[PDB]
């Protein structure tokens, strides 16, 4: 009833919504030495639209650096800078780096809670029980100001925002929260399968952020899943998991010699056929948690077959600047997912991308039917009129409040995992055609045309990459096809 209340509000009143947010970002901002210099005195939305820019990361970053080095954050904001976000997007190799503070996990629990509410409403089975959710902390970077730079998730795990989270089913995981905060990748996955198998008839639901990482710990049972099973049959954990914290939780969860579960597993994993094997092992998951969206629609045949057609649910769309919004038909097919936005997380305009709108740049209630666009976010952070870069189609609208379907991010040319390869990128590697390959696991690039000319044009690209492929291993050694790698 309080549901569908309140997203029969957001989604009727979103022209009041948007104005009354510009209002609630702008006022207490009007005195920052950023939007002084553009002449906004006091709150008024069209002295905002005339004189406030529209900037590119790159136009701003002279702001953002002063920031990150130490200066006071009310030069861009009255709402005091407290981290940074990791964007996955570079500007000349590194990473961009987003100002950040706990309005973005206000705004970011705010869309759990409802997306929680969105899936329980169409899916029946889930509230007695947990998700085998393999969520992943990332170790921080730290910044001469001394405040930390973590990926979006990171800055929620590491909070009390998620220490302290609600007590029910869409928060509640068969990891301890100490393997969740485990900043050793290999280990916590492999703890994530550990107790989901333990607690196997408990899983409702399982998946990842996006669907690479749900395919990759599917690979990883496959490789893994005979010592899994030795571990729940001696009813310890294996030698090799340094983390203390892991030690010590995932030993209580295993709580003792379990041999006959063992058994169970590994007649069912002893199958020459992997098909269904998500249904086989967690026979009560009644959907995947996990975006399909975008570049992540490539691993959509492969969830399926591993999946056995359980429903595949891409909830959310969002940014380093800003969570955009929820997918409200969450049963549909991955092709046909939209994205509504939520009037309350930013102030959103958009940049007309084809001839369908020849305006210069139009509210989020203006934007037409069929037509693409360029979002533009003014954030509770210090952004005011940023570009995403990020291209999105108009394909409805619920209510009063359009539905986007993601198109694609500008020039990006490659991209397998979190890496976000550009043109640019390509082009200085190239000089130092291209496919994307995910026949086979882990997926790697393709750049059509020795072994040492594989190694530079991999040294030449992003982080991102690098921290994909030599350390997570869900990028395989780039190939130049006579067939050459990388190594
Ligand atoms: N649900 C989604 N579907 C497709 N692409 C997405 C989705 N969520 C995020 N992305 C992409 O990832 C970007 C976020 O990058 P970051 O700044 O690293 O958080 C977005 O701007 C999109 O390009």
Not at 45 to 57: A, G, Q
Request: charged share 25%; hydrophobic share 35%.
């Amino acid at each position: 009833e309080t549901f569908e209340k309140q997203l029969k509000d957001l989604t009727s009143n979103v022209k009041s919504i948007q104005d009354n947010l510009l209002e609630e970002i702008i006022t207490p901002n009007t005195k920052t030495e950023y939007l002084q210099r553009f002449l906004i005195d006091r709150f008024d939305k069209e002295l905002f639209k005339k004189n406030v820019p529209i900037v590119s990361y790159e136009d701003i970053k002279p702001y953002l650096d002063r920031v990150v080095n130490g200066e006071s954050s009310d030069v861009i904001s009255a709402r005091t800078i407290t981290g940074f976000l990791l964007s996955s997007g570079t500007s000349g190799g590194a990473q961009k780096m987003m100002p950040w503070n706990n309005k973005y996990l206000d705004n970011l629990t705010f869309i759990y809670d409802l997306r929680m509410q969105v899936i329980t409403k169409h899916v029946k089975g889930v509230e007695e029980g947990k998700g085998m959710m393999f969520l992943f902390t990332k170790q921080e970077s730290m910044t001469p100001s001394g405040l930390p730079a973590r990926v979006a998730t990171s800055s929620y795990f590491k909070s009390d925002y998620f220490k302290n989270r609600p007590s029910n089913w869409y928060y509640s995981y068969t990891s301890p929260d100490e393997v969740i905060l485990c900043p050793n990748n290999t280990e916590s996955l492999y703890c994530h399968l550990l107790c989901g198998l333990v607690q196997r008839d408990e899983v409702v639901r399982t998946g990842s952020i996006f669907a690479s990482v749900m395919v990759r710990a599917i690979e990883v049972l496959k490789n893994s899943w005979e010592e899994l099973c030795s571990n729940i049959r001696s009813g310890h954990l294996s030698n090799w998991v340094t983390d203390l914290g892991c030690q010590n939780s995932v030993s209580l969860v295993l709580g003792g010699p379990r041999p006959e579960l063992a058994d169970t597993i590994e007649e069912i994993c002893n199958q020459n056929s992997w098909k269904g094997i998500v249904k086989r092992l967690w026979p009560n998951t009644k959907y995947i948690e996990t975006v399909v969206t975008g570049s992540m629609g490539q691993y959509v045949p492969m969830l399926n077959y591993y999946c056995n057609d359980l429903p595949l649910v891409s909830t959310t769309y969002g940014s380093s600047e800003t969570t955009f919004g929820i997918n409200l038909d969450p049963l549909c097919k991955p092709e046909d997912v939209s994205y509504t936005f939520m009037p309350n997380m930013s102030y959103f305009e958009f940049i007309p991308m084809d001839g369908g709108d020849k305006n210069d740049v139009v509210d989020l209630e203006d934007v037409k039917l069929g037509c693409t666009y360029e979002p533009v976010v003014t954030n509770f952070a210090g952004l005011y009129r940023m570009r995403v870069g990020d291209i999105v189609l108009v394909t409805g609208f619920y209510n009063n409040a359009p539905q986007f379907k993601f198109v694609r991010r500008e020039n990006v040319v490659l991209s397998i995992d979190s890496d976000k390869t550009n043109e640019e990128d390509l082009f200085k590697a190239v000089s130092q055609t291209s496919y994307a390959d995910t026949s086979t696991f882990p997926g790697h690039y393709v750049v059509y045309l020795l072994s040492t000319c594989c190694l530079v044009m991999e040294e030449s690209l992003d982080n991102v990459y690098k921290r994909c492929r030599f350390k997570d291993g869900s990028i395989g050694p780039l190939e130049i096809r006579a067939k050459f790698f990388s190594i």
